[PDB]
Design a protein around this nucleic acid. Structure first.
Lengths: 50, 98, 50
DNA sequence: GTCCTATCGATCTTCGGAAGAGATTCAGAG
DNA sequence: CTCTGAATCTCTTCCCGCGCGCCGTAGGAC
């Protein structure tokens, strides 16, 4: 009653979250310094960290 | 009177750090607290350091460390970081002039 | 040594020596070009710490 | 199309080891 | 005012063999 099962659809949701955290730490800066006149979302993010 | 200080950037993005620093100055309009920004170049020393004419308030210190891709100042301590020297600024300007 | 062909499977020591030697190159530089205390107290610390 | 110089010089290394021993830090007092 | 007691911190140790399996240097700059 104190120990719970984590199964694949939870461990992968966490490790996916690490990916979004490492996008967060980029896209914030690029959004701050960026002109927001040229940029479109596919310029903002990139898949490599996920 | 504005004295010099040394800033460390991610080595390779140094011109973009200098441009973003000038732009953060003209955003947060502390125009009376910054003189220049030097990246000297020979036909490139120093390899990753940005020279800033500045004064020391904690607001301007947070400004320069809130500029992106900047690690921090290089000095004796992180409370009151260190300016360099009169003759050292003069010699760097000498070799930049020469 | 090679890994599966010429992919280098470095023995780790060559990364440690590479760390040292880079710092020692930079320290000979910033000494002979006569950096101030605050700069050599960077590289000298980084060297001892390597 | 690319030859590298380099590392969180603007975070966050995992809590679920015990032990067992030493180095190093503090009591109630003569 | 610091002397023998005790108190908190880090360092060091944790079977022998053995067989598979995989996966193995990086974001950046001309």
């Amino acid at each position: 009653g104190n120990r719970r099962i984590r199964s694949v659809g939870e461990m992968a949701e966490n490790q996916f979250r690490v990916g979004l955290v490492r996008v967060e730490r980029a896209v914030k800066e690029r959004l701050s310094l960026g002109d927001l006149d040229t940029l479109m979302p596919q310029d903002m993010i990139n898949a490599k960290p996920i | 009177k504005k004295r010099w200080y040394v800033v460390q950037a991610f080595s390779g993005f140094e011109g973009r750090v200098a441009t973003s620093l000038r732009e953060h100055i003209k955003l947060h309009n502390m125009e009376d607290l910054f003189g220049e920004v030097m990246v000297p170049t020979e036909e490139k020393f120093f390899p990753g350091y940005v020279l800033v004419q500045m004064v020391m308030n904690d607001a301007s210190w947070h400004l320069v460390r809130s500029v992106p891709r900047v690690m921090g100042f290089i000095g004796g301590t992180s409370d009151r970081p260190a300016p360099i020297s009169d003759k050292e600024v003069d010699a760097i300007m000498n070799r930049l002039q020469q | 040594v090679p890994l599966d062909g010429g992919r280098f499977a470095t023995s780790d020591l060559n990364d440690l020596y590479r760390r040292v030697i880079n710092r020692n190159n930079r320290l000979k530089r910033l000494l002979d070009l006569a950096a101030p205390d605050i700069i050599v107290r960077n590289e000298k610390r980084m060297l001892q710490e390597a």
